[PDB]
Structures are given as C-alpha cells and as structure tokens.
Design an enzyme around this catalytic site. Structure first.
Site, PDB file in Angstrom:
ATOM      1  N   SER A 153      -8.253  34.974 -19.711  1.00 52.92           N
ATOM      2  CA  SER A 153      -7.601  35.925 -20.612  1.00 52.92           C
ATOM      3  C   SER A 153      -7.259  37.233 -19.500  1.00 52.92           C
ATOM      4  O   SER A 153      -6.456  38.956 -20.479  1.00 52.92           O
ATOM      5  CB  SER A 153      -8.346  36.587 -21.680  1.00 52.92           C
ATOM      6  OG  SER A 153      -8.620  35.359 -22.193  1.00 52.92           O
ATOM      7  N   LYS A 194      -3.798  38.493 -19.666  1.00 54.31           N
ATOM      8  CA  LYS A 194      -3.359  39.537 -20.899  1.00 54.31           C
ATOM      9  C   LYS A 194      -2.194  40.833 -20.528  1.00 54.31           C
ATOM     10  O   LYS A 194      -1.627  41.770 -21.437  1.00 54.31           O
ATOM     11  CB  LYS A 194      -4.663  39.438 -22.080  1.00 54.31           C
ATOM     12  CG  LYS A 194      -4.185  37.845 -22.626  1.00 54.31           C
ATOM     13  CD  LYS A 194      -6.055  37.851 -23.561  1.00 54.31           C
ATOM     14  CE  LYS A 194      -5.565  37.009 -24.418  1.00 54.31           C
ATOM     15  NZ  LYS A 194      -6.929  36.626 -25.224  1.00 54.31           N
ATOM     16  N   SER A 240      -9.671  40.140 -26.451  1.00 52.41           N
ATOM     17  CA  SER A 240      -9.646  39.174 -25.883  1.00 52.41           C
ATOM     18  C   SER A 240      -8.824  38.445 -27.215  1.00 52.41           C
ATOM     19  O   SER A 240      -9.146  37.175 -27.398  1.00 52.41           O
ATOM     20  CB  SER A 240      -9.790  38.661 -24.898  1.00 52.41           C
ATOM     21  OG  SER A 240      -9.411  38.086 -23.829  1.00 52.41           O
ATOM     22  N   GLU A 280      -1.828  30.354 -25.091  1.00 53.96           N
ATOM     23  CA  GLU A 280      -3.433  30.275 -25.936  1.00 53.96           C
ATOM     24  C   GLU A 280      -3.197  29.456 -26.459  1.00 53.96           C
ATOM     25  O   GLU A 280      -2.004  29.039 -28.115  1.00 53.96           O
ATOM     26  CB  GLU A 280      -3.503  31.252 -26.613  1.00 53.96           C
ATOM     27  CG  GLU A 280      -3.711  32.457 -25.290  1.00 53.96           C
ATOM     28  CD  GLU A 280      -4.773  32.487 -24.711  1.00 53.96           C
ATOM     29  OE1 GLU A 280      -4.865  34.114 -23.489  1.00 53.96           O
ATOM     30  OE2 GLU A 280      -5.242  31.578 -24.700  1.00 53.96           O
ATOM     31  N   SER A 298     -12.491  34.471 -19.788  1.00 58.00           N
ATOM     32  CA  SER A 298     -13.483  33.444 -19.942  1.00 58.00           C
ATOM     33  C   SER A 298     -12.665  31.864 -20.069  1.00 58.00           C
ATOM     34  O   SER A 298     -11.949  31.712 -20.955  1.00 58.00           O
ATOM     35  CB  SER A 298     -14.752  33.404 -21.337  1.00 58.00           C
ATOM     36  OG  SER A 298     -15.090  34.458 -21.186  1.00 58.00           O
TER      37      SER A 298
END
Ligand SMILES: *[B@@]1([O])OC2=C(C([O])=O)[C]=[C][C]=C2[C][C]1[N]C(=O)[C][C]1[C][C][C]([N][C][C][N])[C][C]1
Length: 261
Positions: free
Chosen positions: A43, A46, A103, A139, A210
């Site tokens: 992440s 992002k 997240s 994702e 993660s």
C-alpha cells in the site's frame, strides 16, 4: 559505518530482508541499506496513485470533487471506509484520503481506474523521473509480495527520491503538494512503524503497507524538531508466506538511522 552494522544486525535478528533509504535534507546526505534492491510496495504505492490524481487535477478544476459510485462489486479484501458508502458516491478527494489515511483498497482501485490503470500510474512515475517504480496490478493482488517477483515493486532509493520530490520538491503544484502532505500527516495507520522509532515531538506524514510474506513497509516525510526535513523509506519482507507483520522492525530501523540527529 556504525549505522550500517546496526542495520545489518537488525536484519539478522528479524530473519527477513530489510531495505532502508534515508535522505537528510540538512546536508543532502543519505543512509542506504539494500537501497537498490526491489521490494513489493504494497500500500505504499497509494502515494503514487494519489499524486497522479493530484497532478491530473492541476489541469482539471474541481476534479477532486468528482463523484464516484461505490458498489458491492467494488468491495475487495480491506474496505474500512468504502464499506460505509456502498451504493452512494465518494469524491475523489474522499477516496484519496481514505486510501492514504486508512489504507482503504477500494479507494486505491478508484484512484487507479480514474487515471487509466496501473500502467498509467507507472507512466506518471516515469514522468517524474522515477524509472524504478512499477505498479502492475490492482487491489488486492498487488500485495502478494512473492520473493523473486518484480511486479508491484520499487527500490528504497527510488521511493525516497520520489517521495522527496512529491512532498518537499516541485512534482506537484503548491496547492496539490500541500494537500498530499496534509493527507499523509493525517494518516491513522503509521503509529507503530517509522513513527514509533522517532521522538514524540517530531512530525510525520507517512504511508504504510502490508502484504504477503509478512511484508511490512512505511515511507515517510519527517519534520524533526528544529531541523531540516527527512525522507525515510523502510521496506521489510520475510521468507515465509504466512509470516506475521513486523512493524517493530521498521521502528527499529528508523531509530537506528536517526539516533544522534
Ligand atoms: B496495504 O498494503 O495497506 C494495508 C495496511 C498497511 O497500510 O499497513 C494494513 C492492512 C491492510 C492494508 C491494505 C493493503 N494490503 C493488503 O491488501 C494485504 C494485507 C495482507 C495482511 C492482512 N492482514 C492479515 C492479518 N492476519 C491485511 C491485508
């Protein structure tokens, strides 16, 4: 040298692979550890997606207010914000904040889609001068973090340099740069990671990640008390598919490279 040794030590104790890049804008120096190796961003990617939307907004007034429908079919594995908005709309600003500060993975997917997909996020990175970053998928699969797999990876060096451009440099217009930094300073997921290795008085804007293989990441812009800012990337990944996250390793790394500043 001492710092080098201590990071090696921490790596050994952790059992995994550790990547660190610190840029100290006081003196334009760096501390690097496996800074040219690739790591799955998870992440932390992002930031790049939100920055691409911010860049798009410089030539599209009011883009950040554009609405986006959230449907059941949009839900993925981790939807802390989006699950509260199913079958309404969220603005692109809202989605950017949710991606960066919680997240949220739906929110990332909407940022990705808006700009044209993973290859478009990657092309934006290239336009900034980052030739290392690659966002390959959406994702949630971008977080598999399989050892040896170059998909969805970057190096600590490259990500530190790009994050300094985005947060401290001129990649974005002043309004857009301030908005990115504001969002990152409002992150809710980073208190156990880089933050946890710094004095309580220091101000941090960060983005965690993660993934599989116990991948545990954080990238941060840091304003130490009465000092010039720092940029710090700490990436960590483990040998076992189902390894548990190790935010403490990132905190330790942050302490090692900033202790004595
Ligand atoms: B992403 O990497 O960011 C993220 C974080 C983070 O910022 O530290 C925490 C939790 C979820 C997310 C979403 C993104 N990652 C994933 O989608 C994969 C991740 C894998 C581990 C899962 N928790 C397992 C605990 N047994 C959560 C999803």
């Amino acid at each position: 040298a001492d710092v080098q040794q201590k990071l090696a030590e921490l790596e050994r104790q952790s059992g995994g692979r550790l990547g660190v890049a610190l840029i100290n804008t006081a003196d334009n120096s760096q501390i690097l550890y496996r800074a040219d190796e690739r790591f799955a961003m998870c992440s932390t990617s992002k930031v790049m997606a939100a920055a691409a939307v911010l860049k798009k907004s410089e030539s599209e007034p009011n883009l950040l207010n554009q609405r986006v429908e959230i449907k059941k079919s949009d839900l993925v594995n981790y939807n802390p914000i989006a699950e509260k908005h199913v079958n309404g709309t969220m603005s692109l600003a809202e989605l950017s904040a949710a991606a960066l500060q919680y997240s949220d993975n739906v929110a990332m997917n909407k940022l990705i889609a808006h700009v044209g997909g993973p290859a478009s996020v990657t092309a934006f990175a290239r336009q900034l001068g980052d030739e290392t970053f690659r966002l390959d998928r959406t994702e949630p699969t971008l977080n598999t973090a399989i050892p040896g797999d170059p998909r969805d990876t970057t190096s600590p060096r490259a990500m530190a340099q790009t994050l300094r451009n985005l947060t401290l440099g001129k990649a974005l217009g002043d309004s857009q740069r301030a908005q990115l930094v504001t969002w990152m300073k409002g992150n809710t997921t980073g208190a156990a990671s880089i933050q946890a290795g710094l004095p309580a008085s220091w101000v941090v804007g960060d983005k965690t990640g993660s993934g599989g293989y116990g991948t545990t990441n954080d990238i941060a812009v840091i304003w130490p008390k009465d000092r010039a800012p720092l940029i710090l990337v700490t990436y960590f990944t483990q040998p076992q598919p189902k390894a548990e996250s190790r935010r403490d390793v990132l905190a330790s790394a942050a302490k090692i490279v900033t202790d004595g500043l």
